[PDB]
Design a binder for this molecule. Structure first.
Ligand SMILES: *[C@@H]1O[C@H](CO)[C@@H](O)[C@H](O)[C@H]1NC(C)=O
Ligand SMILES: *[C@@H]1O[C@H](CO)[C@@H](O)[C@H](O)[C@H]1NC(C)=O
Ligand SMILES: *[C@@H]1O[C@H](CO)[C@@H](O)[C@H](O)[C@H]1NC(C)=O
Ligand SMILES: [Ca+2]
Lengths: 197, 178
């Protein structure tokens, strides 16, 4: 039930003594086929100057600014041993912990079919998770592949996505257009119809 | 190369917000340590009911990062980075239907530093209610992004604008969607 952190390393200033300065730190866990790779990044403003990579097993200077930090931190066998332990310690721990609510998170898409403001038919697929989604257009049961524009996958910033899929249509009376959405949160595909009239 | 990327991202600066400590799963913020109230804030109710994170772990990391900041201000001989202006986009959460509730999303992207002023305007009038915002989300390119939200009821007489002030912008960026 508890997420684990590891403390960032200290760059000592020593003892001797609009305007803006920024420092950014990142602890990145890359999960892949059971494996865990850990990267610890030290950034001054937009400049990553030093980093720990589990595939290297030590700190390496990204720019000349991080040369004192590579030299110093690598001479501390205690720092190296705790960083090397991260993939199996926090990376693996947090990934297993945050499993049912993250990788096993499945939120169903809401589908709306409406003609545009070359007549265009808009399939607005909204509020779903994960991002991977299949949207297919059909006219009287036959799939329409040409004249189809799929927007970029839109991240809402609230743990949901949205996508707009539009088709170039030439509608006759009685024509039935169908937007078919397939997603990991759905047992059977979702189908929304539009009658030309 | 990964199926999933879990990252703790923290920043510390001279201007407001002075610091930020957060955890993201696949570029989405799961939780953050509110530095002012000094407590863990979970993005979704479900994350809080299932998990826990001790606030002291964030606060301690901010302290370490602040020490590293001061050392680098000295080392870099007071190097201030160039102000990188944002790219703004306004889009609704749901397909628009006149009279039916919706959320307008203002997505401010590719900016540095994470210092910004964002206002919602309806017909040239400042809007204070129904407003919400995300944190300064750290991008993999060491730039930032942010989300601003406005809950509204679509009206053909109501014109919404998202105004953003940033040091890299001489004039404020004014973006819209009906
Ligand atoms: C890891 O991935 C490789 C293919 O990239 C696969 O052959 C292997 O079975 C996977 N798991 C293990 C235990 O090596
Ligand atoms: C800071 O200035 C000194 C000269 O006084 C120079 O030797 C040093 O390399 C400078 N460092 C940076 C990062 O500009
Ligand atoms: C934000 O607004 C305040 C006044 O409310 C001002 O001091 C500051 O310079 C503004 N500009 C930016 C880009 O933050
Ligand atoms: Ca340490």
């Amino acid at each position: 039930q508890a997420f684990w952190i590891d403390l960032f390393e200290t760059i000592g200033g020593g003892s001797l003594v609009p305007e803006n300065y920024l420092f950014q730190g990142r602890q990145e866990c890359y999960a892949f086929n059971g494996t865990q790779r850990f990267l610890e990044r030290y950034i001054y403003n937009r400049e990553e100057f030093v980093r720990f990579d589990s595939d290297v097993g030590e700190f390496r200077a990204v720019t000349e600014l991080g040369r004192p930090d590579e030299e110093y931190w690598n001479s501390q066998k205690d720092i190296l041993e705790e960083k090397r332990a991260v993939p199996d310690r926090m990376c693996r721990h947090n990934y297993e912990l945050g499993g049912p609510m993250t990788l096993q998170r499945r939120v169903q898409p809401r589908v709306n079919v409406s003609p545009s403001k070359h007549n265009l038919l808009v399939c607005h697929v909204t509020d779903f998770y994960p991002g991977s989604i299949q949207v297919r257009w059909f006219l009287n049961g036959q799939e329409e592949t040409a004249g189809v524009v799929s927007t970029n996958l839109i991240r809402n910033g609230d743990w949901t996505f949205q996508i707009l899929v539009m088709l170039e249509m030439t509608p006759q009376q009685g024509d039935v257009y169908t937007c078919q959405v397939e997603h990991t949160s759905l047992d059977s595909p979702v189908t929304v119809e539009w009658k030309a009239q | 190369k990964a199926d999933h990327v879990s990252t703790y991202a923290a920043f510390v600066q001279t201007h407001r917000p002075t610091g930020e400590f957060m955890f993201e799963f696949d570029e989405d913020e799961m939780f953050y340590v509110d530095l002012d109230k000094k407590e863990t804030v979970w993005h979704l109710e479900e994350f809080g009911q299932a998990f826990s994170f001790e606030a002291q772990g964030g606060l301690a990391n901010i302290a370490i990062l602040n020490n590293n900041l001061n050392t680098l201000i000295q080392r870099s001989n007071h190097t201030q980075a160039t102000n990188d202006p944002p790219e703004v986009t306004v889009f609704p959460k749901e397909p628009v239907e006149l009279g039916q509730p919706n959320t307008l999303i203002c997505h401010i992207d590719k900016f540095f530093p994470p210092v910004l002023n964002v206002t919602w305007l309806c017909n040239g009038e400042l809007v204070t209610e129904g407003v919400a915002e995300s944190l300064f989300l750290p991008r993999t390119d060491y730039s930032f992004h942010k989300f601003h939200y406005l809950t509204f009821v679509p009206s053909a007489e109501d014109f919404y604008d998202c105004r953003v002030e940033h040091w890299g912008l001489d004039q404020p960026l004014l973006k819209h969607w009906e």
